[PDB]
Amino acid sequence: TVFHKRYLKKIRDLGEGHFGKVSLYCYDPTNDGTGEMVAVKALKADAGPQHRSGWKQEIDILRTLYHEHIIKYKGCCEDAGAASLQLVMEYVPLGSLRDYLPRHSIGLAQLLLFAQQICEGMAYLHAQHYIHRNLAARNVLLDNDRLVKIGDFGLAKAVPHEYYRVREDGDSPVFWYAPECLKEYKFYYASDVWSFGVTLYELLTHCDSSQSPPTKFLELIGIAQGQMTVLRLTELLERGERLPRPDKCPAEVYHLMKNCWETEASFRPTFENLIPILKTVHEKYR
Numbered sequence: 001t002v003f004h005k006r007y008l009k010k011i012r013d014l015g016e017g018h019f020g021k022v023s024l025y026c027y028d029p030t031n032d033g034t035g036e037m038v039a040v041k042a043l044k045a046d047a048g049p050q051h052r053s054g055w056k057q058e059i060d061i062l063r064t065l066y067h068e069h070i071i072k073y074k075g076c077c078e079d080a081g082a083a084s085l086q087l088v089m090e091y092v093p094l095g096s097l098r099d100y101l102p103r104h105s106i107g108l109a110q111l112l113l114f115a116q117q118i119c120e121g122m123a124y125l126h127a128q129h130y131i132h133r134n135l136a137a138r139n140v141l142l143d144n145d146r147l148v149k150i151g152d153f154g155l156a157k158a159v160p161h162e163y164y165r166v167r168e169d170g171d172s173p174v175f176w177y178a179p180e181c182l183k184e185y186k187f188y189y190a191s192d193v194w195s196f197g198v199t200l201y202e203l204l205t206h207c208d209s210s211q212s213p214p215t216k217f218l219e220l221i222g223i224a225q226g227q228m229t230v231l232r233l234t235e236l237l238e239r240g241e242r243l244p245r246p247d248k249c250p251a252e253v254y255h256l257m258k259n260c261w262e263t264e265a266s267f268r269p270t271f272e273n274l275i276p277i278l279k280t281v282h283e284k285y286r
């Protein structure tokens with residue numbers, strides 16, 4: 001599919017993606033305002049050869065993924081300004097779970113349905129042989145109060161092999177990362193399950209920033225540490241220390257969370273394992 005830049009009417013900026021920014025447009029070929037509202041992802045113009053090869057990878061990943069709990073790719077556009085392409089996605093107006101949950105009081109049942117949907121989308125992603133590497137509430141879009149979709153794929157990679165070797169990066173979401181990613185710089189399919197546990201914790205805390213993984217971990221570690229945040233994080237996780245049980249979170253749900261956080265990656269449930277578990281848990285509390 002292809003969109004004409006000539007009919008893209010900028011409305012506002014949505015935020016920052018990994019290789020550039022996300023912007024809201026009205027694609028209006030008839031010029032009457034009835035046009036579809038689209039979310040467009042662009043390559044930041046001053047990007048080097050490294051950020052450009054990474055952007056082409058994300059484009060390719062996004063134009064092949066089709067799942068009901070994964071953001072719908074619409075097509076592309078020629079970005080004459082950055083001499084590349086602009087990724088046209090469906091606009092999800094209610095936004096991210098990180099933005100939505102602290103402003104709307106969502107019940108336990110719905111939060112579990114969201115977790116179930118994240119798993120459905122993630123089991124599909126793993127079957128397509130890709131790892132997400134950035135599974136967080138921030139990257140989960142709410143289509144409606146009963147429908148959630150994985151919305152960002154900036155750090156997503158193809159697994160040829162059960163793990164991918166990651167680079168020592170400063171933009172890595174370390175507070176959502178398994179010990180083997182921090183220690184060995186290896187990202188397994190199971191590493192994505194650790195992140196789901198963290199995403200699940202964020203939902204049961206309603207994305208309250210005072211209860212957030214960075215706030216919680218940086219209270220435990222402290223900030224007197226000189227270039228030793230990741231080391232202390234790896235160390236506290238080895239000691240078996242974890243983020244606490246969110247208020248009013250069911251006991252067995254916290255057990256599932258703690259199981260997604262097994263130090264040994266092999267002892268963590270797959271995304272396929274979690275789908276029947278979460279369907280049952282959602283039914284029990286609905």
Ligand SMILES: O=C(Nc1nccc2[nH]c(-c3c(Cl)cccc3Cl)nc12)C1CC1
Binds near residue numbers: 022092138
């Ligand atoms: O931005 C909105 N919806 C969105 N619709 C469609 C696509 C969207 N991509 C994002 C988004 C942004 Cl900007 C930054 C980090 C992670 C993500 Cl996932 N948000 C998207 C809502 C709030 C207006």
